[PDB]
Amino acid sequence: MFHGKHPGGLSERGRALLLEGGKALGLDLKPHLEAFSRLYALLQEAGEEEVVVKHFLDSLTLLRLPLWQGPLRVLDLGTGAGFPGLPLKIVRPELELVLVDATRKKVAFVERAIEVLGLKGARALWGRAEVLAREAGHREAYARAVARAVAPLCVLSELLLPFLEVGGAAVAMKGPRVEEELAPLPPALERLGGRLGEVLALQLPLSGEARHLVVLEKTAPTPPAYPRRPGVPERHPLC
Ligand SMILES: C[S@@+](CC[C@H](N)C(=O)[O-])C[C@H]1O[C@@H](n2cnc3c(N)ncnc32)[C@H](O)[C@@H]1O
Ligand SMILES: Nc1ncnc2c1ncn2[C@@H]1O[C@H](COP(=O)(O)O)[C@@H](O)[C@H]1O
């Protein structure tokens, strides 16, 4: 079984892995195979298949929190090649997504993916978080924000919280270990207008690797001091 090949897209095996992992998360990914297969093709053009199908499914674990109903404006901060934002947008088309990265080549890739996949209401944007969050067009302008593989929580919270409207929420995607990053976090969140929401432990669908989704709730406006200038949260983190 699963012998069929594909010159520029997911193989029969890769399609089946994606569907199976999807069903484990509670998702029916059949309507979205072509979109994911195209995205896979784009990545290859820029084990191989399995690993990508895992970036897809890791991104889709966001759907294990019911945070994504309706035309919410969502920021994917530090999106790289479009993760977790592109899979999210594929499976929740009503979301109005902005995908940010400081590296032009990555933003150029996301922009191309958006067009090739024919996504509507997704924009890639080149910029730094610390600078974009001081513009009225982005500061406290999002209902949701997400980030994967960007920074430790104490730094990442200073980067994410300023983009959220009050009442909004951010998800920091993390791996198997979060105790150390969480322990000193609540007092820093309060300085930012945030508070710690749920920390959901879950297992990645095909591999069983441990993951945590860390929810940051926006409870009050962020003081003008934050975020600090580029590089400063990283070198003098709040915790
Ligand atoms: C390790 S990559 C992870 C990319 C993607 N989120 C993923 O998980 O596949 C982190 C990305 O964050 C970007 N980045 C880090 N700090 C940033 C900042 N302060 N503002 C904008 N982009 C940032 C980097 O340029 C890089 O492409
Ligand atoms: N230990 C520290 N904790 C927090 N901020 C600092 C610290 N040392 C310097 N700063 C501030 O961080 C910014 C850059 O400082 P520097 O790292 O000396 O370039 C400046 O606004 C300083 O006022």
Swiss-Prot record:
Enzyme Commission number(s): 2.1.1.170
InterPro entries, per database record: rRNA_ssu_MeTfrase_G, SAM-dependent_MTases_sf
Disulphide connectivity of cysteines: 154-239
Predominant location: cytoplasm
GO cellular component: cytosol
Superkingdom of origin: Bacteria
Alphabetic keyword roster: Cytoplasm, Disulfide bond, Methyltransferase, rRNA processing, S-adenosyl-L-methionine, Transferase
Reaction catalyzed: guanosine(527) in 16S rRNA + S-adenosyl-L-methionine = N(7)-methylguanosine(527) in 16S rRNA + S-adenosyl-L-homocysteine
Region (RNA binding): 235-236
Entry binding sites for S-adenosyl-L-methionine: 78, 83, 101-103, 129-130, 148
Statement: the UniProt record of this protein carries the keyword S-adenosyl-L-methionine: yes
Record-linked SUPFAM superfamilies: S-adenosyl-L-methionine-dependent methyltransferases
Null allele phenotype: Low-level streptomycin resistance.
Family indicated by similarity: Belongs to the methyltransferase superfamily. RNA methyltransferase RsmG family.
Function according to Swiss-Prot or TrEMBL: Specifically methylates the N7 position of guanine in position 527 of 16S rRNA. Shows a marked preference for deproteinized 16S rRNA as substrate and is completely inactive with native 30S subunits as substrate.
Name listed for the protein in its UniProt record: Ribosomal RNA small subunit methyltransferase G
